[PDB]
Amino acid sequence: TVGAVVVDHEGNVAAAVSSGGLALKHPGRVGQAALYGCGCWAENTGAHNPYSTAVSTSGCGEHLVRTILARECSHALQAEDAHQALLETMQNKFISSPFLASEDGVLGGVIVLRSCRCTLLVEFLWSHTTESMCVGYMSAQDGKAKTHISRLPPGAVAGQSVAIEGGVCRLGSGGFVLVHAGAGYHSESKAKEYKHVCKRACQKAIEKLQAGALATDAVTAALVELEDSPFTNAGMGSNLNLLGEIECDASIMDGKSLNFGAVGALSGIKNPVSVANRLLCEGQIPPCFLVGEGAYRWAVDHGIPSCPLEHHHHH
Amino acid sequence: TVGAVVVDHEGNVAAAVSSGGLALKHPGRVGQAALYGCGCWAENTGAHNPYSTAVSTSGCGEHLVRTILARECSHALQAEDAHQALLETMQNKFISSGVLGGVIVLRSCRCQTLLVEFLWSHTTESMCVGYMSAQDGKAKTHISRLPPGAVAGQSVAIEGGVCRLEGSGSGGFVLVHAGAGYHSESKAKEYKHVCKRACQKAIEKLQAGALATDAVTAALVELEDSPFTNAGMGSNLNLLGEIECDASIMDGKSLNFGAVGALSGIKNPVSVANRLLCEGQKRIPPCFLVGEGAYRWAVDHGIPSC
Ligand SMILES: */C=C\S(=O)(=O)N1CCN(Cc2ccc(OC(F)(F)F)c(F)c2)CC1
Ligand SMILES: C=CS(=O)(=O)N1CCN(Cc2ccc(OC(F)(F)F)c(F)c2)CC1
Ligand SMILES: [Cl-]
Ligand SMILES: [Cl-]
Ligand SMILES: [Cl-]
Ligand code: NA
Ligand code: NA
C-alpha cells in the first residue's frame, strides 16, 4: 500500500491511497484502499470542523476496514493536540478496537496532515504498528524533500505497539505533501529505494501544485510515482492473487467538495489511482466506485493508459 | 433495495441489505449496499454502546456528501430518545445537506426481558415495512407514506413502535423493508405480502435456534426473490442490460461482516454475503468479494446460480 496527503496554498486538502492487496488473495477480494472512509479521507475546514484534515492509510488484512480508520483519524484530529489524538486513535480505535478483539496482532499505518489559517499552519504525522514505515514530505517553500524510515523502538512488539512521529510547517502558490511507500517489515536492503521513491513522489506533487494544479491532481501525481516503483505493493509489482494475477484497489478524496473516487479489483491499468482520480474529476448520478471488468472498460474508454495483456476477463 | 434487522432471544442483533442498484448504471458500479458501514450495521451493546443496534438502509444512488449512513444512525441511536435521534439524522443527511432514501432500525437493551424499540424513516414518497415478534405469532405489514402535500426529498416520514420479549425463550424480533420509492397502489398488495413472508421466514429460523445472521439472511432471501423488489430477481438492469447486485450483512455479536458487489449470475446475493461472514468465523479470510471472482467463489461454495 502507498498513500499521500496534500494541502494547497489555500488550505484545500486531498488524500489518496493505492494497493495491490493481500498476496495470494482470492480473485475479486477488495480491501481498504478502495473503501470509503477506510483507506483515505480528506475534509476541508467547515462549521463543526475547524481544521482541514487529510488521511491516508497502509497495511493489509481487514484491520483498517473493520475500524474505518481514515475517517476515524480525521475526526480525532479535530481535538487541539493532534499528536495525542492520533496516538490514542491508533491505540484505542485500532489496536484495542472491539472490531479486532479476536486478532493476535493488528498491523497498519497512517499518514495525516491538518491545516488551519492563523499564513497556513500545517501539522503532519505518521504512525504505525508495523516494524517500520517509510515516509517523505516536502513544502513548496523548503525546496528539498525529506525522507525518513520510522521504526518501532527496541522493546516494542509489532502489532501491539505504536510508533508516532511528526512535525509542523508554516506556509503564494505553494503547499505541502506527505507520502508513504508502505508499512511493514524492515528491509534495510531496499531502504534507499523506498526513500528515493518517496522523494520523487513528493517532488511530483509539489511540481503539480507550483504549476497551479488542484490538490487532487497533486496527490494523484505523487501516487503515480509510488505505484510505479516495482518495490511497492501497488500498481506495478502488486502482489499476485491466488491465480497469479494482479488486482488493484485505489481511492481518492477531495477535501473541498467531499467528492470521492475509487476502483477495486482492477486489472490491466498501469496506474489504478488515475482511474479513481478520473472518476472524482468526471463526477464534479455519476459513479464514484467501479470494480473489475467494468472499471477496466471505463478507464479504457476515458483514455487512461492500459495494458491488454495484463487484463483478465474470466467470465 | 431490500433490508432487514433481527434481534434474537438473547439480545444479539444482525442487519443485512441487498440491492440491484441504479438502473442503467455503468457496468461494475458498486453502491452503498455493499459498503461497510454504509448499507447496514449491527453492533451488540458494549462499553460505549449501551444499546444493541441494527440498521439497514435504502437509497437510489445519489450519494451523500460525507455520511456512512447506517453506522451513523447506529451511533445516533445511543441517545436516549431514539425517535428524535433518527429524525435529526435523517434531517441532516437528507434534507439539510433533495436526497431520496430510507432506513429501518432497531435498538434493544436487557432489562430478564428484552426491550426492543424499532423505527423506519424515509424521504421517498412511500416505503413498505413488515415486522413480527416470535411471541405475537402474526406478521404485521405496513405502507408508510409522506404526509399529503409533502415533497419527496424535502420531507421525512418516521414511524415505529416498541416490543417486549421473554428473555429466555428461543424468540426474537425482525423488521424488514421491501424498498423505498414511488408509491404504487397497484403493487402494494405484493409488497406487503413479501414483507409478511420475509418476517415469517426469519422468525421460523429464530425459533429453530438459528443465529441472528441466519435469520436476517432468510428474510432477505424472500425479499430478493420477489420480482417487484430492486434486489436479486428483478434487479434493475445496468447500461448493458445485465444484472449486478450488491449485498452485505453484519453480526452484532462478533462485528463480522460479509459483502458482495457487482455480483452477476447468483440468485440470492445475500446468501453469498452471509456465507463469507459464516466462513470468516471458522490467511485472513475474505469479507468483501466483487464481480467474476465473487461469482466463482459462490459457485465453488455451493450457492445456486441463474
Ligand atoms: C501487508 C502489508 S502489504 O501492503 O502487503 N506491504 C508489503 C509491501 N511493503 C513494502 C514496504 C515494507 C516496508 C517498508 O518500510 C521501510 F521502512 F521502508 F522498510 C516500506 F517502505 C515498504 C509494505 C507492506
Ligand atoms: C430508489 C430507487 S430503487 O431503484 O432502489 N427502487 C425501485 C423499485 N422500488 C420498488 C418499491 C417501491 C415502493 C415500495 O413501497 C410501497 F410504497 F409500499 F410500495 C416498495 F416496497 C418497493 C423501490 C425503489
Ligand atoms: Cl481471500
Ligand atoms: Cl454509472
Ligand atoms: Cl469482474
Ligand atoms: Na509498485
Ligand atoms: Na427482487
XYZ file of C-alpha atoms and ligand atoms in Angstrom:
674
model
C 0.000 0.000 0.000
C 1.083 3.578 -0.760
C -0.544 6.891 0.090
C -0.291 10.642 0.021
C -1.931 13.680 1.543
C -1.592 17.194 0.140
C -2.563 20.725 1.156
C -2.529 23.535 -1.414
C -1.721 27.184 -0.758
C -5.375 27.932 0.094
C -5.778 25.189 2.697
C -7.592 22.763 0.381
C -6.637 19.158 1.141
C -6.787 15.898 -0.746
C -5.830 12.331 0.026
C -5.292 9.153 -1.974
C -4.252 5.531 -1.423
C -3.427 2.635 -3.745
C -2.677 -1.037 -3.104
C -2.261 -4.481 -4.565
C -3.953 -6.073 -1.522
C -3.208 -9.321 0.271
C -0.786 -11.603 -1.527
C -2.434 -14.765 -2.876
C -5.919 -13.291 -2.221
C -8.963 -14.822 -3.868
C -9.969 -13.125 -7.140
C -12.345 -10.222 -6.532
C -11.251 -9.534 -2.948
C -11.498 -5.781 -2.385
C -9.768 -4.221 0.631
C -9.300 -0.916 2.468
C -7.677 1.081 -0.345
C -10.989 1.122 -2.256
C -13.390 1.575 0.644
C -14.971 4.908 1.509
C -13.757 6.178 4.883
C -11.248 3.324 5.396
C -8.309 3.893 3.027
C -8.301 7.694 2.831
C -10.177 10.787 3.919
C -10.000 14.478 3.176
C -12.237 17.145 4.660
C -11.748 20.905 4.407
C -12.405 23.060 7.436
C -16.081 23.835 7.951
C -18.667 24.712 10.579
C -18.026 21.829 13.010
C -14.553 21.073 11.543
C -12.050 23.821 12.482
C -9.175 22.009 10.708
C -8.685 20.839 7.155
C -7.578 17.204 7.513
C -6.291 14.561 5.112
C -5.583 10.932 5.990
C -4.168 8.006 4.067
C -3.655 4.514 5.458
C -1.425 1.478 4.996
C -1.487 -2.201 5.853
C -3.405 -5.175 4.592
C -5.947 -7.569 6.007
C -9.336 -6.384 7.162
C -7.919 -4.373 10.080
C -8.360 -0.910 8.541
C -11.776 -1.687 7.055
C -13.309 -3.018 10.295
C -12.345 0.206 12.082
C -12.992 2.808 9.307
C -9.594 4.093 10.271
C -9.053 7.063 7.962
C -12.283 8.855 8.786
C -11.761 7.974 12.446
C -8.357 9.672 12.456
C -9.756 12.701 10.676
C -12.441 13.057 13.362
C -9.963 12.601 16.213
C -7.724 15.323 14.720
C -10.315 17.998 15.419
C -9.067 17.969 19.010
C -6.456 20.537 19.993
C -3.467 18.206 20.468
C -3.012 16.357 17.175
C -0.259 14.067 18.441
C -2.337 12.866 21.424
C -5.438 12.457 19.225
C -3.683 10.284 16.648
C -1.784 8.241 19.268
C -4.988 7.493 21.208
C -6.785 6.570 17.980
C -4.016 4.165 16.987
C -4.057 2.602 20.445
C -7.771 2.610 21.306
C -9.593 2.699 17.988
C -7.143 0.498 16.072
C -5.094 -1.819 18.316
C -7.616 -2.407 21.130
C -10.717 -1.938 18.958
C -13.596 -4.325 19.722
C -13.773 -4.953 15.942
C -10.326 -6.584 16.182
C -10.556 -8.254 19.587
C -10.138 -11.765 18.098
C -6.785 -10.879 16.464
C -3.282 -11.807 17.632
C -1.738 -8.557 16.379
C -3.010 -5.546 14.349
C -0.712 -4.291 11.577
C -1.053 -0.940 9.858
C -0.137 2.694 9.497
C -1.423 6.155 8.656
C -0.148 9.486 7.386
C -2.090 12.621 8.288
C -1.978 16.342 7.892
C -4.171 19.081 9.268
C -4.022 22.750 8.429
C -5.687 25.932 9.589
C -5.093 29.547 8.657
C -3.801 31.585 11.607
C -0.204 32.060 6.619
C -1.003 28.317 6.803
C -0.128 26.156 9.810
C 0.369 22.553 8.681
C 0.828 19.753 11.200
C 1.708 16.363 9.774
C 2.162 12.983 11.420
C 2.768 9.324 10.695
C 2.041 6.386 12.938
C 2.319 2.623 12.595
C 2.253 -0.693 14.447
C 4.393 -2.441 11.835
C 8.130 -2.773 12.437
C 8.809 0.163 10.133
C 7.319 2.656 7.682
C 8.881 4.892 5.026
C 7.606 8.456 4.620
C 8.535 11.508 2.625
C 7.375 15.069 2.898
C 8.011 18.407 1.317
C 6.912 22.019 1.380
C 6.874 24.121 -1.772
C 8.986 26.721 0.059
C 11.713 24.471 1.514
C 12.574 23.187 -1.965
C 14.035 19.860 -0.791
C 12.108 16.714 0.065
C 12.863 14.975 3.358
C 12.541 11.213 3.754
C 12.554 9.136 6.901
C 12.218 5.494 7.921
C 10.096 5.285 11.048
C 10.842 2.212 13.166
C 9.391 0.660 16.280
C 11.700 1.355 19.271
C 13.661 -1.507 20.883
C 11.344 -3.445 23.179
C 8.223 -2.632 21.181
C 6.235 -5.504 19.691
C 4.970 -5.293 16.115
C 1.173 -5.388 16.068
C 0.958 -4.416 19.771
C 2.892 -1.131 19.902
C 2.558 2.279 18.297
C 5.289 4.498 16.901
C 4.204 8.041 16.091
C 6.262 10.981 14.795
C 5.592 14.248 13.049
C 6.315 17.938 12.702
C 4.963 21.366 11.822
C 5.381 23.690 8.832
C 4.290 27.268 8.241
C 3.475 28.336 4.693
C 1.787 32.197 -2.794
C 1.204 29.130 -4.973
C 2.828 26.638 -2.580
C 1.672 23.796 -0.372
C 2.781 20.673 1.441
C 2.837 16.938 0.732
C 3.336 13.867 2.931
C 3.644 10.489 1.228
C 4.348 6.938 2.247
C 5.716 3.905 0.419
C 4.261 1.359 2.828
C 4.231 -0.015 6.361
C 5.629 -3.469 7.016
C 8.747 -5.476 7.777
C 12.059 -3.689 7.886
C 14.107 -4.236 4.725
C 17.431 -2.446 5.146
C 18.435 -3.666 1.678
C 15.561 -1.838 -0.056
C 15.621 1.213 2.273
C 17.271 3.671 -0.132
C 14.873 2.745 -2.945
C 11.833 3.362 -0.741
C 13.353 6.673 0.358
C 14.161 7.523 -3.259
C 10.620 6.842 -4.474
C 9.151 8.882 -1.597
C 11.418 11.784 -2.644
C 10.367 11.677 -6.310
C 6.721 11.361 -5.292
C 6.881 14.493 -3.134
C 8.592 16.419 -5.933
C 5.894 15.441 -8.410
C 3.133 16.698 -6.103
C 4.987 19.924 -5.323
C 5.604 20.416 -9.050
C 1.867 19.998 -9.772
C 0.977 22.489 -7.035
C 3.527 25.059 -8.192
C 2.056 24.790 -11.698
C -1.435 25.555 -10.296
C -2.888 22.025 -10.221
C -5.704 21.025 -7.909
C -4.854 19.300 -4.650
C -6.304 16.093 -6.096
C -4.105 16.311 -9.182
C -1.068 16.853 -6.950
C -1.810 13.864 -4.750
C -2.594 11.747 -7.803
C 0.765 12.635 -9.382
C 2.552 11.560 -6.197
C 0.669 8.264 -6.052
C 1.514 7.597 -9.693
C 5.204 7.726 -8.796
C 4.671 5.497 -5.768
C 2.664 2.923 -7.767
C 5.320 2.852 -10.497
C 8.040 1.647 -8.126
C 8.407 -2.132 -8.605
C 9.139 -2.322 -4.858
C 5.713 -1.074 -3.624
C 2.609 -3.268 -3.304
C 0.599 -1.026 -5.639
C 0.494 -0.574 -9.392
C 3.457 -2.322 -10.977
C 4.685 -5.071 -8.701
C 1.405 -5.504 -6.810
C 1.086 -8.844 -5.007
C -0.258 -11.708 -7.083
C -3.583 -13.194 -6.129
C -4.351 -16.896 -5.767
C -4.392 -17.271 -9.579
C -1.095 -15.435 -10.027
C -2.834 -12.308 -11.292
C -2.849 -8.630 -10.360
C -5.957 -6.946 -8.898
C -5.583 -3.364 -7.632
C -7.512 -1.124 -5.212
C -7.246 2.667 -5.157
C -9.218 5.666 -3.955
C -9.013 9.430 -3.606
C -10.974 12.118 -1.810
C -11.243 15.868 -2.311
C -11.479 17.861 0.911
C -13.091 20.909 -0.731
C -16.046 19.206 -2.419
C -16.013 15.972 -0.327
C -16.140 14.023 -3.584
C -14.630 10.571 -3.766
C -13.471 8.173 -6.469
C -12.378 4.568 -6.145
C -11.603 1.368 -8.023
C -11.467 -2.180 -6.752
C -10.241 -5.468 -8.147
C -8.932 -3.610 -11.220
C -6.618 -5.392 -13.733
C -4.879 -4.168 -16.869
C -4.450 -0.497 -15.854
C -0.941 0.734 -15.168
C -1.978 3.396 -12.627
C -5.154 2.491 -10.675
C -5.095 5.838 -8.837
C -5.529 7.574 -12.186
C -8.898 5.879 -12.712
C -10.008 6.832 -9.210
C -8.901 10.420 -9.842
C -10.679 10.456 -13.198
C -13.916 9.339 -11.518
C -13.617 12.164 -8.993
C -12.940 14.665 -11.791
C -15.789 13.468 -14.010
C -18.109 13.299 -11.021
C -17.969 17.060 -10.465
C -25.592 10.396 -10.783
C -22.024 9.768 -11.915
C -20.305 6.726 -10.396
C -17.784 7.045 -7.603
C -16.808 3.366 -7.174
C -16.198 0.959 -10.072
C -14.795 -2.580 -9.858
C -13.429 -5.383 -12.001
C -14.258 -5.676 -15.679
C -16.454 -2.577 -15.811
C -13.803 -0.437 -14.157
C -11.245 -1.526 -16.750
C -13.669 -0.777 -19.581
C -14.496 2.626 -18.117
C -10.784 3.505 -17.811
C -10.045 2.435 -21.377
C -12.978 4.477 -22.666
C -11.629 7.543 -20.827
C -8.164 7.445 -22.366
C -6.394 6.048 -19.297
C -3.295 4.046 -20.310
C -3.984 0.326 -20.253
C -2.224 -2.963 -20.997
C -4.454 -5.623 -22.616
C -2.020 -8.482 -21.925
C -2.341 -7.808 -18.163
C -6.182 -7.760 -18.092
C -8.189 -10.914 -17.302
C -11.879 -11.499 -18.090
C -12.670 -14.959 -16.709
C -16.462 -14.733 -17.372
C -33.038 -2.100 -2.205
C -34.366 -4.510 0.470
C -33.290 -4.859 4.099
C -33.904 -6.492 7.444
C -32.843 -6.306 11.090
C -33.159 -9.071 13.678
C -32.690 -9.425 17.409
C -32.519 -12.921 18.887
C -33.815 -14.055 22.253
C -30.512 -13.131 23.965
C -30.280 -9.580 22.608
C -27.859 -10.363 19.752
C -28.586 -8.264 16.665
C -27.936 -8.643 12.939
C -28.520 -6.471 9.878
C -28.464 -7.051 6.133
C -29.113 -5.194 2.871
C -29.427 -6.192 -0.794
C -29.850 -4.147 -3.945
C -29.760 -4.163 -7.724
C -28.540 -0.605 -7.638
C -29.054 2.263 -10.026
C -30.906 1.444 -13.234
C -28.737 1.836 -16.357
C -25.614 2.176 -14.179
C -22.250 1.724 -15.811
C -21.021 -1.882 -15.515
C -19.014 -2.519 -12.356
C -20.634 0.312 -10.387
C -20.880 -0.716 -6.724
C -23.163 1.218 -4.384
C -23.985 1.581 -0.698
C -25.491 -1.901 -0.228
C -22.000 -3.457 -0.487
C -20.043 -0.876 1.548
C -19.015 -1.473 5.148
C -20.840 0.886 7.484
C -22.980 2.445 4.746
C -25.679 -0.073 3.793
C -26.091 -1.909 7.096
C -24.734 -2.034 10.614
C -25.182 -4.264 13.650
C -23.477 -3.737 16.974
C -24.236 -5.541 20.244
C -24.268 -3.460 23.399
C -20.781 -2.713 24.677
C -18.570 -0.305 26.603
C -19.570 2.936 24.849
C -22.692 1.358 23.242
C -25.464 0.928 25.861
C -27.944 -0.422 23.265
C -27.697 -3.286 20.840
C -28.407 -1.594 17.497
C -29.097 -2.822 13.952
C -29.549 -0.631 10.860
C -30.350 -1.274 7.212
C -30.637 1.470 4.648
C -32.148 2.154 1.256
C -31.113 4.694 -1.354
C -31.498 5.471 -5.040
C -27.828 6.165 -5.903
C -27.400 9.890 -5.180
C -24.582 9.512 -2.667
C -24.500 11.613 0.480
C -21.727 14.180 0.982
C -19.878 12.604 3.895
C -22.187 10.252 5.732
C -21.539 6.477 6.099
C -25.226 6.261 6.849
C -26.033 3.021 8.680
C -23.160 3.303 11.150
C -24.074 6.963 11.699
C -27.680 6.016 12.554
C -26.461 3.295 14.920
C -24.385 5.886 16.771
C -27.282 8.360 16.842
C -29.458 5.640 18.365
C -27.275 5.677 21.506
C -29.052 8.857 22.563
C -31.987 8.492 24.954
C -34.750 9.498 22.515
C -34.470 7.149 19.517
C -37.253 8.824 17.531
C -35.636 12.257 17.810
C -32.170 10.836 17.125
C -33.179 9.113 13.899
C -35.224 12.110 12.763
C -32.354 14.526 13.331
C -30.046 12.211 11.415
C -32.485 11.913 8.521
C -32.876 15.689 8.522
C -29.160 16.476 8.414
C -28.130 13.730 5.991
C -31.024 14.050 3.509
C -32.937 17.352 3.761
C -30.423 19.832 5.238
C -27.117 18.968 3.429
C -33.150 16.618 -2.356
C -31.857 13.134 -1.475
C -34.142 10.080 -1.575
C -33.754 7.167 0.816
C -34.930 5.311 3.891
C -33.775 3.318 6.912
C -35.015 0.640 9.280
C -33.525 0.431 12.756
C -33.944 -1.396 15.993
C -32.265 -0.973 19.339
C -32.563 -3.361 22.270
C -31.429 -3.500 25.862
C -31.776 -6.176 28.524
C -33.973 -5.324 31.499
C -34.628 -10.980 32.362
C -36.598 -9.399 29.479
C -35.691 -7.625 26.246
C -36.998 -4.170 25.298
C -36.982 -3.602 21.533
C -37.571 -0.167 20.017
C -37.934 -0.210 16.229
C -38.335 2.506 13.622
C -38.401 3.209 9.909
C -37.907 6.522 8.189
C -37.811 7.725 4.615
C -37.767 10.765 2.348
C -39.186 8.772 -0.546
C -42.870 9.047 -1.345
C -43.529 5.676 0.282
C -41.908 2.631 1.922
C -43.212 -0.844 2.778
C -42.115 -2.469 6.039
C -43.031 -5.611 7.898
C -42.303 -6.769 11.402
C -43.058 -9.676 13.681
C -42.150 -10.943 17.111
C -41.676 -14.587 17.933
C -44.384 -14.263 20.608
C -47.128 -12.379 18.720
C -47.124 -15.070 16.035
C -48.636 -12.873 13.306
C -46.666 -10.689 10.926
C -47.613 -7.036 10.528
C -47.046 -5.229 7.236
C -47.415 -1.529 6.601
C -47.055 1.053 3.834
C -45.557 4.324 5.058
C -46.360 7.441 3.035
C -45.163 11.006 3.079
C -47.894 13.235 4.539
C -50.199 14.628 1.825
C -48.712 17.782 0.353
C -45.158 16.859 1.337
C -42.408 16.725 -1.281
C -40.175 13.681 -1.688
C -36.607 14.622 -0.818
C -37.759 17.553 1.331
C -39.863 15.755 3.968
C -39.092 12.947 6.410
C -41.626 10.332 7.468
C -40.785 8.373 10.600
C -42.828 5.721 12.412
C -42.102 2.918 14.805
C -43.074 1.020 17.885
C -41.983 -0.938 20.941
C -41.914 -4.674 21.640
C -41.054 -6.650 24.794
C -39.593 -10.158 24.611
C -39.302 -13.031 27.048
C -35.548 -13.066 27.547
C -35.137 -16.833 27.752
C -37.205 -18.494 25.072
C -35.984 -19.036 21.546
C -37.759 -15.933 20.342
C -36.711 -12.629 18.898
C -37.846 -9.870 16.602
C -37.457 -8.896 12.943
C -38.104 -5.733 10.921
C -37.871 -5.766 7.100
C -38.497 -3.359 4.243
C -39.214 -4.088 0.586
C -37.869 -0.795 -0.659
C -38.451 2.927 -0.528
C -39.631 4.692 -3.660
C -42.554 5.988 -5.681
C -45.921 4.949 -4.296
C -47.510 2.174 -6.369
C -51.005 1.376 -5.115
C -51.263 -1.447 -7.677
C -48.201 -3.354 -6.398
C -48.978 -2.591 -2.744
C -50.545 -5.999 -2.153
C -47.428 -7.864 -3.286
C -45.067 -5.608 -1.307
C -46.982 -6.180 1.940
C -47.177 -9.871 1.047
C -43.429 -10.283 0.513
C -42.624 -8.461 3.787
C -45.036 -10.809 5.580
C -43.350 -13.902 4.140
C -39.894 -12.449 4.861
C -40.679 -11.857 8.553
C -42.093 -15.346 8.992
C -39.005 -16.928 7.436
C -36.793 -15.021 9.880
C -38.969 -15.901 12.902
C -39.012 -19.591 11.875
C -35.197 -19.538 11.769
C -35.034 -17.962 15.235
C -37.448 -20.475 16.772
C -35.341 -23.350 15.399
C -32.271 -21.940 17.192
C -30.575 -20.298 14.201
C -28.186 -17.396 14.573
C -29.492 -13.871 14.096
C -27.411 -13.624 10.909
C -29.044 -16.770 9.507
C -32.451 -15.302 10.390
C -31.796 -11.976 8.691
C -30.417 -13.863 5.675
C -33.599 -15.957 5.388
C -35.717 -12.790 5.371
C -33.618 -11.148 2.651
C -33.777 -14.313 0.530
C -37.578 -13.978 0.423
C -37.388 -10.230 -0.267
C -34.831 -10.751 -3.056
C -36.936 -13.419 -4.795
C -39.891 -11.070 -5.299
C -39.686 -9.679 -8.874
C -41.094 -6.359 -7.612
C -38.057 -5.527 -5.447
C -34.853 -3.991 -6.814
C -32.789 -6.890 -5.458
C -31.954 -10.379 -6.615
C -34.533 -11.407 -9.213
C -35.985 -8.312 -10.885
C -32.988 -6.059 -10.084
C -32.526 -3.006 -12.290
C -30.531 -3.697 -15.421
C -27.311 -1.800 -15.949
C -26.351 0.183 -19.045
C -25.603 -3.044 -20.963
C -28.776 -4.884 -19.920
C -27.153 -7.032 -17.212
C -27.907 -7.669 -13.531
C -25.232 -6.693 -10.996
C -26.089 -6.998 -7.329
C -24.646 -5.522 -4.141
C -25.294 -7.042 -0.709
C -23.913 -7.118 2.805
C -24.617 -8.384 6.298
C -23.194 -7.645 9.750
C -23.253 -9.591 13.021
C -23.770 -7.582 16.198
C -22.088 -10.155 18.438
C -18.807 -10.706 16.582
C -18.884 -7.492 14.497
C -18.020 -9.629 11.481
C -19.189 -8.540 8.070
C -19.641 -10.066 4.640
C -20.315 -8.378 1.351
C -20.603 -8.756 -2.418
C -20.581 -6.142 -5.130
C -21.279 -6.176 -8.858
C -22.394 -9.782 -8.493
C -23.955 -11.467 -11.536
C -25.411 -14.897 -12.092
C -26.243 -15.671 -8.442
C -29.898 -15.990 -7.442
C -29.559 -14.783 -3.837
C -26.689 -12.305 -3.360
C -27.328 -12.035 0.407
C -26.539 -15.769 0.713
C -23.018 -15.161 -0.616
C -22.509 -12.314 1.863
C -23.834 -14.485 4.680
C -21.580 -17.328 3.533
C -18.479 -15.064 3.615
C -19.428 -13.980 7.142
C -20.038 -17.602 8.099
C -16.731 -18.768 6.630
C -14.889 -15.827 8.184
C -15.674 -17.181 11.654
C -14.458 -20.755 11.041
C -4.542 -16.006 5.914
C -7.359 -13.637 6.902
C -10.494 -14.985 5.166
C -12.165 -12.547 2.774
C -15.056 -10.335 3.778
C -15.785 -8.448 0.504
C -15.808 -10.031 -2.973
C -16.884 -8.454 -6.273
C -17.630 -9.358 -9.893
C -16.425 -12.538 -11.586
C -14.319 -13.623 -8.604
C -17.327 -13.358 -6.277
C -19.368 -15.477 -8.712
C -16.616 -18.113 -8.840
C -16.288 -18.158 -5.043
C -20.066 -18.529 -4.668
C -20.263 -21.332 -7.225
C -17.356 -23.072 -5.504
C -19.238 -22.858 -2.193
C -22.442 -24.458 -3.495
C -24.543 -21.289 -3.704
C -27.133 -21.585 -6.527
C -26.801 -19.777 -9.891
C -29.039 -18.058 -12.514
C 0.700 -6.496 4.352
C 1.304 -5.371 4.062
S 1.494 -5.017 2.322
O 0.580 -3.843 1.811
O 1.460 -6.431 1.605
N 3.067 -4.410 2.202
C 4.036 -5.346 1.618
C 4.979 -4.417 0.895
N 5.524 -3.454 1.862
C 6.599 -2.658 1.269
C 7.322 -1.910 2.357
C 7.717 -2.550 3.517
C 8.375 -1.841 4.500
C 8.638 -0.514 4.305
O 9.307 0.153 5.316
C 10.605 0.540 5.262
F 10.865 1.460 6.202
F 10.902 1.079 4.075
F 11.416 -0.519 5.448
C 8.245 0.106 3.153
F 8.510 1.407 2.970
C 7.589 -0.572 2.177
C 4.502 -2.606 2.505
C 3.585 -3.540 3.273
C -34.503 4.222 -5.168
C -34.899 3.582 -6.253
S -34.626 1.809 -6.455
O -34.343 1.585 -7.993
O -33.668 1.195 -5.361
N -36.199 1.179 -6.157
C -37.002 0.993 -7.367
C -38.088 -0.030 -7.036
N -38.894 0.409 -5.887
C -39.851 -0.649 -5.517
C -40.730 -0.279 -4.328
C -41.456 0.895 -4.353
C -42.246 1.248 -3.280
C -42.322 0.431 -2.190
O -43.155 0.833 -1.140
C -44.513 0.928 -1.246
F -44.956 2.177 -1.247
F -45.156 0.309 -0.253
F -44.916 0.400 -2.403
C -41.605 -0.735 -2.159
F -41.711 -1.504 -1.051
C -40.805 -1.103 -3.211
C -38.075 0.820 -4.720
C -37.003 1.833 -5.108
Cl -9.038 -14.147 0.079
Cl -22.972 4.948 -13.550
Cl -15.331 -8.546 -12.688
Na 4.566 -0.684 -7.286
Na -36.262 -8.722 -6.415
